[PDB]
Amino acid sequence: LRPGRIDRKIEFPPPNEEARLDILKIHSRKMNLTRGINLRKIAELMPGASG
Amino acid sequence: IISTHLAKLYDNLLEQNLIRVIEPFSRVQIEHISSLIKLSKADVERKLSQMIL
Amino acid sequence: IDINDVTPNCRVALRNDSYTLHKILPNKVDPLVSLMMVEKVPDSTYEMIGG
Amino acid sequence: DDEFEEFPAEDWAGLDEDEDAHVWEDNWDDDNVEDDFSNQLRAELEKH
């Protein structure tokens, strides 16, 4: 973290509802999912979950 | 539930009964098989056609 | 054998009676770095990482 | 190669454009001109 090197730093809180839904979509993209799969309802049923 | 499954059990038993009846034969008659299994000739013939298929 | 081919970290074969380099045996480079390119990284975008 | 110059290639005088050029499978029976199998069955039922 010395000047002249990688000094800038960005923080990451635990994901919120929208972030959780997006991560679920990203990780479920490459899977055979049936019609009318409500990943939003899955995210709601999964509160306070991490990556 | 037993009533629901009675039809399938009947079909399976008819299949096995026909097999057992026609086991000791090479050119048995459909009329004779019907007489042995106590069913109509048309029904026995149709079931045998389905079994061959 | 020309010394220029006797590079650091290369397997060699030494004779029995007197250790005398007489061959440059094949070496396993083992490149472990050419297997983590993800090209342009398609389908990884801000819109779908919303949040 | 032994290009068979003696036998000429068919003349392209007309060279009409392809009528339909459908590429499915051709098959011989398609040429037959039937009479609407539905109508055939209706006639068969009517005449018993």
Added chain:
Amino acid sequence: GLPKNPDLRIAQLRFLLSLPEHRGDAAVRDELMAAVRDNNMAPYYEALCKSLDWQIDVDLLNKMKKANEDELKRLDEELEDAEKNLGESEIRDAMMAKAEYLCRIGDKEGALTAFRKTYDKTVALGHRLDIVFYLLRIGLFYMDNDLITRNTEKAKSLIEEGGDWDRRNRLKVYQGLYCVAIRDFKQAAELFLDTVSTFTSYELMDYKTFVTYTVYVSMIALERPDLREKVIKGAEILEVLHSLPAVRQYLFSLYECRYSVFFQSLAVVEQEMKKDWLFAPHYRYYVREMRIHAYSQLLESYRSLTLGYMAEAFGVGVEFIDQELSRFIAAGRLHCKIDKVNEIVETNRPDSKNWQYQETIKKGDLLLNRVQKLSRVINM
């Protein structure tokens, strides 16, 4: 999960009008006219009048061209505003909107050029696949076979590079429709069965129509065991069919060997397929193949049979069955011979050993031809 653009019901209605029988369908004409009025398709209205020799309602077409020009100039101005300052994103959306409206109005070439430019600028794989899907749908709407093939290959290449399995399944459905178009019913049935449980392309057809198409292709492409394990015992297919008494009867008649009902169902299906735009070309091949399939199914369990019995089973006369069996035996489809002095249909299914010997002779002759040609060519 995609736009209804171009609306394929428009293609269906245009085909219905082109058909000589229904060219006077007042109701169909009204529905097509309402759709074109709402969507403001000036190029399509011009083309439709040119093709159908219909009078041009210049009163409507005037305001319609006015609205089209207004919208086009709006889109061009918005695109210019985007490119002036905004970097990407907005400009791509502007081009997408312009091309989408051009497709919605019907300008084939303008829409294709706009989509090509949009694809050239776009870099997101999802958006690239969306563009390719728009082009594939245009090719389906206008039965542009070369465009369809090129876009299918491009979409396959994109999916290989990497893409969502949702888009994979959508591509499967698109390929299935194209296969039905070009008469590849085996692949059509395979893809449709694979996508029966993962159907999201409501842009192309309703789910009921999709299941009917899957049933139709399956009973012609699938043997009895596969038809048993997949279609008739398919939970989703049965669930959908519960609301389609005709298609269920059509399938179960063949499966259960109720041949008169099967023939009636095929009779109605013939008219349905002829009216349908996708199946209309192959509306006789399917019927003939289904008839051959039924005859072969009946004969598969009979060494000898009576033409009277066949006629009774199929609910037809003796002469009709005689003609059909003669035609198919001559064509080489059915394995049987007809005895007329005594009306018997003796079966003549080949012996496996002998069929294998003939196949070996044929294939080995081809291979030996090729080997001899290679040996000769080696020195000259």
Added chain:
Amino acid sequence: EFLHAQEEVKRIQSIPLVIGQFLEAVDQNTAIVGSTTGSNYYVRILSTIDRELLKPNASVALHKHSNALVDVLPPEADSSIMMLTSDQKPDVMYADIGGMDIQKQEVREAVELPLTHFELYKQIGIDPPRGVLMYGPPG
């Protein structure tokens, strides 16, 4: 005469040989072998040896003095013996265990289900597990 010579070159396969490990093939007629004495060598391969059998890290027998690769032993000599499965086989049935139905399902699925099926495992995008970790309190 070639057939005769092949049989006469086998006297280089005298009984008191030294087991080794075949590492890499250099030119053909040569190779690099790791003896069990703890040293590697650049040695010659006997012509009669079937080169199909020289899989990497395959057990081989070397001449005691020359250390020449002379024979390719069966796949494994090995010192980590395998379960005799006739007298060393445990006597604990599945029934002797009570409950643990979920654990039994998971264990007999992760190391028998991939053995079976496998035509459903990729269809849904998940990959079969290489191993299983059983963790819990003491007993």
